[PDB]
Amino acid sequence: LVPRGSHMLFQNVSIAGLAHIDAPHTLTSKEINERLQPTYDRLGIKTDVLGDVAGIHARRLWDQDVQASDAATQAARKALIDANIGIEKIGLLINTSVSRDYLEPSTASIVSGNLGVSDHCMTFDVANACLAFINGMDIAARMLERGEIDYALVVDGETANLVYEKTLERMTSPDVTEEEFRNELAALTLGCGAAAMVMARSELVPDAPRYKGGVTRSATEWNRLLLIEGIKLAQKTFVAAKQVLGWAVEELDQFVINQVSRPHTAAFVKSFGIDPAKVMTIFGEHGNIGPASVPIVLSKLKELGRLKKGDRIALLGIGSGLNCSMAEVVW
Amino acid sequence: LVPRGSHMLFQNVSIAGLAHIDAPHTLTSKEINERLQPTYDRLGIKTDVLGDVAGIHARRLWDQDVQASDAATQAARKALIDANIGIEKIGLLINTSVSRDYLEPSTASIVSGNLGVSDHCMTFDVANACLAFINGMDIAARMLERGEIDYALVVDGETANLVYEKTLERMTSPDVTEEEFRNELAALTLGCGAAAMVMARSELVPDAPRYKGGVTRSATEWNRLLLIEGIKLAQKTFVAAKQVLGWAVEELDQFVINQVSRPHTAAFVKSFGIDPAKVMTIFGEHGNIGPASVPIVLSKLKELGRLKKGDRIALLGIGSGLNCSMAEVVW
Numbered sequence A, B: 001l002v003p004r005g006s007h008m009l010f011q012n013v014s015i016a017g018l019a020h021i022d023a024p025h026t027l028t029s030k031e032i033n034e035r036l037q038p039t040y041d042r043l044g045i046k047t048d049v050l051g052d053v054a055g056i057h058a059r060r061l062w063d064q065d066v067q068a069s070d071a072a073t074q075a076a077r078k079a080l081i082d083a084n085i086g087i088e089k090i091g092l093l094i095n096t097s098v099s100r101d102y103l104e105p106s107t108a109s110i111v112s113g114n115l116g117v118s119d120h121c122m123t124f125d126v127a128n129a130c131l132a133f134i135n136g137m138d139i140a141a142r143m144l145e146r147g148e149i150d151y152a153l154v155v156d157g158e159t160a161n162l163v164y165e166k167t168l169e170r171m172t173s174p175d176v177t178e179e180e181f182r183n184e185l186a187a188l189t190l191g192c193g194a195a196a197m198v199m200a201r202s203e204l205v206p207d208a209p210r211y212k213g214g215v216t217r218s219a220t221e222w223n224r225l226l227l228i229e230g231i232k233l234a235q236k237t238f239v240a241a242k243q244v245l246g247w248a249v250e251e252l253d254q255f256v257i258n259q260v261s262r263p264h265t266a267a268f269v270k271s272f273g274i275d276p277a278k279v280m281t282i283f284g285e286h287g288n289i290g291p292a293s294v295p296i297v298l299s300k301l302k303e304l305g306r307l308k309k310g311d312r313i314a315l316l317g318i319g320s321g322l323n324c325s326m327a328e329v330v331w
């Protein structure tokens, strides 16, 4: 009768399985710079924007022409093994990546066809920049909590090889200006990789990690500056999380944050007073893997044995929109 | 304790408002053919594939460079007027179109920024070829039924002007073959338009039309032939609808079908024995408006006064994937 925050949390949703793929090919910003060196000179910038401003040593790329669906399929296979279940159990598959095979059909239907889902499995894509994986988890959770399905797959594969090729080669043309060159430059922090998660009704997977859900706030009036507005949005979203999830910063055990740049992380951790030891980071070697960053970090934590039963894990993203979501997992 | 179909239907979800935009510029297939006539000759095809095989007289195009977000925004404004509510009531906005402004941010966040949504409004895109509008209605319904929100906007704007321009001009090049030309040709059945819907909790809008929900089946192994497999998927989806919604063909008052081609409609209506008078059609003058087709047809029905309290309306789509969804509205 009387609402309270805790009421809209999910009670019967768990994480049954989780996997990630690291893309194989390391590319350093050293190599990239040396390719860029003559156009650094030409325009006359002595600053190493990548290594020094952004703090990115290197990112990973695919070795072949891997399509988003290919990478998601691979991660999906691993996550079904992690969960110990066959594909015939899956009732929903959502694809959440920014990289997409086609305008249509959906990338989800391609991954579904690859894995061999049943004729009962519902499939669609969600797009929301870096927050989409959290969006897809929530959409699946609502079907699970209702009892419409028993298992769901949320997948995300990212490719940046073609982005680099076009952009690297603009940023060595004689006809490029500075406002041009500086804009294009952000393209070169992006990285490749993939992640997948199997979610389930908790009674099917007793004592699996629990997905409680979370909150979203937006500042779509905004669809130096991005950083400031991002932090302000995140502060407001943190209040909403206090109100629903009962969060205090000191009671949380990990912060799984979308992975952008050393300054952006720095600003985030200071502004909320977080112990940086509770914020695993991968941008400096993997670059920014977009919406796949969050589950990839969570999967790496699990695998390095860094999580334990009862840990409170905060998943959080600030994304173009602007949008900000925060959700809790209890390991 | 014991499941039954009716259990997973929505009890507290209504349609509060509905609007469509027709794109202004008529283009006939006559004109298009006369532009194509010399390359009909060259390859030596005496068949009028558009007018005779597909049955499309004409489609509508935008007069200016209208972006998907622009068209959705317009339809959205109309639907909020239809519903008699301000944008500050909206807690969710989902964009379901195939046409997209950017890889990111989401088209939804752009429409949201245009309308002026509150900082509480969650926004994201869904992509699933022609079925997405039905997918977005269902996603919103689950949030509404739970009580997470009170009002949602589902929007869809489609643009095809640029598709035509590139394609028309391939299909007049000297270097085009027949397998090429025939493939490209399907591009020219597509049309422009937009639709928006306001959904709400039923107690907020007493005696509004009721959204019950529906069912989905897939044949993603398939991600002349498409037609046959489509009908077979639809027949299986109809069985699922019988099992959940209790459908019989004769008990339904309208069939709101995604709008493809005269043969595809024909095959559909015969295979299920539907009275063609219960299947409003717009493809012959508007072409195929993709996922916007369904709500656009529903909006036209309402406006021509063709629906009455208690009418059972079947929304149905067969889409690339292959996927098939069917849902019920009770007017």
Ligand SMILES: C/C=C\C/C=C/CCC(=O)[C@@H](O)CC(N)=O
Pocket (backbone or CB within 6 Å): A128, A129, A130, A131, A226, A227, A228, A230, A231, A259, A260, A264, A268, A288, A290, A318, A319, A320, B104
């Ligand atoms: C501090 C606020 C900024 C963090 C947000 C991320 C911006 C840089 C990116 O990584 C974007 O691609 C994220 C996105 N598109 O949603």
Ligand SMILES: C/C=C\C/C=C/CCC(=O)[C@@H](O)CC(N)=O
Pocket (backbone or CB within 6 Å): A104, B128, B129, B130, B131, B226, B227, B228, B230, B231, B259, B260, B264, B268, B288, B290, B318, B319, B320
């Ligand atoms: C009879 C089965 C075929 C009907 C399906 C539609 C195919 C033609 C189109 O209109 C596609 O664009 C639909 C789609 N992409 O989901």
Ligand SMILES: [Mn+2]
Pocket (backbone or CB within 6 Å): A024, A025, A026, A063
């Ligand atoms: Mn290599």
Ligand SMILES: [Mn+2]
Pocket (backbone or CB within 6 Å): B024, B025, B026, B063
């Ligand atoms: Mn005109």
